[PDB]
Amino acid sequence: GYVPAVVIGTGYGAAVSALRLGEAGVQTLMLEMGQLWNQPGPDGNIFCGMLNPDKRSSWFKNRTEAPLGSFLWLDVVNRNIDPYAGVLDRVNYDQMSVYVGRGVGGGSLVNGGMAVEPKRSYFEEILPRVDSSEMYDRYFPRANSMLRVNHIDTKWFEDTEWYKFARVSREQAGKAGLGTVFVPNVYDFGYMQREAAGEVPKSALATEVIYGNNHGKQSLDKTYLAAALGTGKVTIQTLHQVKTIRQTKDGGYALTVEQKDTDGKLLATKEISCRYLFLGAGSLGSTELLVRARDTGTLPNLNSEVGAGWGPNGNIMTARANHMWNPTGAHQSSIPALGIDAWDNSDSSVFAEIAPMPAGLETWVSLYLAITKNPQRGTFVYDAATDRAKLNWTRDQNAPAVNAAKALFDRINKANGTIYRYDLFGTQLKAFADDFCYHPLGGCVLGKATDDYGRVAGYKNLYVTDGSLIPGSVGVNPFVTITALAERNVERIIKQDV
Numbered sequence: 001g002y003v004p005a006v007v008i009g010t011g012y013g014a015a016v017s018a019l020r021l022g023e024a025g026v027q028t029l030m031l032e033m034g035q036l037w038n039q040p041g042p043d044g045n046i047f048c049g050m051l052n053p054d055k056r057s058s059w060f061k062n063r064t065e066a067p068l069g070s071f072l073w074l075d076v077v078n079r080n081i082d083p084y085a086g087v088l089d090r091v092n093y094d095q096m097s098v099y100v101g102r103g104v105g106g107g108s109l110v111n112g113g114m115a116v117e118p119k120r121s122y123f124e125e126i127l128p129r130v131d132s133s134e135m136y137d138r139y140f141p142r143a144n145s146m147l148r149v150n151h152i153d154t155k156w157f158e159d160t161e162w163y164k165f166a167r168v169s170r171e172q173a174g175k176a177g178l179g180t181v182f183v184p185n186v187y188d189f190g191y192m193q194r195e196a197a198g199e200v201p202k203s204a205l206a207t208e209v210i211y212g213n214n215h216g217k218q219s220l221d222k223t224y225l226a227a228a229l230g231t232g233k234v235t236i237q238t239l240h241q242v243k244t245i246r247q248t249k250d251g252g253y254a255l256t257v258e259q260k261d262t263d264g265k266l267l268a269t270k271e272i273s274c275r276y277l278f279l280g281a282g283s284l285g286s287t288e289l290l291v292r293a294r295d296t297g298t299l300p301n302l303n304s305e306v307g308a309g310w311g312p313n314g315n316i317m318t319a320r321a322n323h324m325w326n327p328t329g330a331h332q333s334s335i336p337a338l339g340i341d342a343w344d345n346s347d348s349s350v351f352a353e354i355a356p357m358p359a360g361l362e363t364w365v366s367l368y369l370a371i372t373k374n375p376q377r378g379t380f381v382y383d384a385a386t387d388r389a390k391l392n393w394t395r396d397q398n399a400p401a402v403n404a405a406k407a408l409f410d411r412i413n414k415a416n417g418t419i420y421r422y423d424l425f426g427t428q429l430k431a432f433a434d435d436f437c438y439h440p441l442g443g444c445v446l447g448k449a450t451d452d453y454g455r456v457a458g459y460k461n462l463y464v465t466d467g468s469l470i471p472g473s474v475g476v477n478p479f480v481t482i483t484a485l486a487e488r489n490v491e492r493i494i495k496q497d498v
């Protein structure tokens with residue numbers, strides 16, 4: 001059937017867009033391929049934890065996986081599982097594996113909550129056509145408020161066993177002349193205190209994050225999406241995957257949509273049409289829909305920039321072995337609190353998340369997710385044979401990112417007389433994991449594939465809203481940028497187009 005606006009997906013771009021559409025009185029249907037995560041499972045919890053993964057951990061995989069960095073300790077809990085509509089999806093391309101959330105709320109379900117604005121000077125470099133004053137004066141503050149961003153209590157942080165891992169890396173970085181910053185979060189830090197005090201059910205302090213948090217984390221289902229539903233103008237249909245998009249003869253859009261059960265069985269195929277179509281299927285999902293539409297002839301007026309300009313936000317994982325006198329703790333909060341800020345906009349820039357280890361015993365390992373400035377980009381190329389977008393990125397394209405991460409952590413090792421771990425990412429001696437991504441950015445870049453507000457070039461009333469808009473890099477964890485840009489874009493679109 002017909003509905004005035006359709007939003008594909010329910011991540012950050014989608015959730016912002018649907019809230020503002022509903023507030024403007026536009027009846028809106030959101031289509032989400034994953035589940036609404038609200039049913040207690042076999043342990044009485046909605047989500048599995050990192051030490052008890054089960055089918056809920058994984059989108060259609062036959063075996064659980066250890067979180068990257070943790071295989072040496074967490075492989076013991078891996079098990080065979082039924083392919084199921086679980087929450088975290090590892091999407092494998094030829095030389096890159098991208099992790100994304102699947103469910104109502106998208107990556108907000110599975111992410112570490114780190115809610116950080118990019119440096120304005122870097123924002124201005126990456127998106128020179130965008131008015132940065134409005135972003136920093138209006139849209140970033142709006143996003144932080146709506147997302148329920150909050151700040152850790154520094155005294156509690158300094159004293160608690162749960163953040164010893166962070167304090168150790170702070171001290172070690174400091175000996176190399178490198179500073180740290182507290183990173184705001186959407187996990188409720190007041191709740192986290194009460195967890196440590198034994199007052200409320202643990203989540204961050206019970207090795208939960210990457211397969212969901214049963215408590216504490218203000219994912220989008222609690223914030224933007226709850227508000228969108230509260231307008232009375234928004235509904236969400238789950239286990240509905242959009243496959244194809246075409247433009248009707250009178251200039252609206254028609255979608256083919258598959259409805260599945262949680263075992264992946266096809267229940268129905270539906271046609272849904274609309275006046276305004278908003279893509280919020282993520283860097284991977286929105287880009288795939290548009291390259292498919294271009295290259296199968298259903299949106300033939302899409303431009304050549306659709307598919308282009310993808311990067312992994314310079315993501316590189318690495319780890320250091322601490323001295324025996326610098327244990328990182330058996331008890332590590334699953335939510336990061338600190339980053340090493342070595343980002344100066346040069347090619348040696350690094351912003352490094354100090355990541356927790358979920359082993360639950362002492363390993364002496366410090367783990368880092370480095371975010372770097374690497375100009376290499378990949379392209380999603382349609383394969384008509386298999387009907388998939390294939391990202392053409394090669395591992396050698398991450399060499400500049402590795403080089404920047406290694407230069408920084410070499411300074412820390414030199415100052416402290418420590419060495420890397422080489423055994424955390426597989427049998428091959430490898431200190432830097434260079435073929436994964438948690439922060440996919442690009443594919444439908446703002447001002448390239450779209451105008452400066454995400455209006456898809458070649459088409460009217462067709463919008464992209466999400467991480468596919470970002471040109472490969474933001475220098476920090478990306479969801480605040482995605483949210484703030486989505487606030488800017490939908491406000492303009494409603495004013496001028498709707």
Ligand SMILES: Cc1cc2c(cc1C)N(C[C@H](O)[C@H](O)[C@H](O)COP(=O)(O)OP(=O)(O)OC[C@H]1O[C@@H](n3cnc4c(N)ncnc43)[C@H](O)[C@@H]1O)c1[nH]c(=O)[nH]c(=O)c1N2
Pocket residue numbers: 008009010011012013014031032033034099100101102103104105106107108110111112113114115116210240241242243280281282283285286289438439440466467468476477478479480482
């Ligand atoms: C493990 C891990 C850890 C982190 C992070 C990710 C991951 C995987 N991130 C990244 C962050 O989560 C990510 O950048 C955003 O979720 C991206 O938001 P989008 O709106 O682009 O898509 P997002 O991926 O959130 O949502 C897309 C949604 O569309 C759905 N979908 C896709 N194709 C569809 C289709 N064809 N039909 C229907 N539905 C479809 C998906 O199932 C999904 O729910 C992060 N960022 C950050 O700033 N701070 C952090 O601490 C972290 N930590």
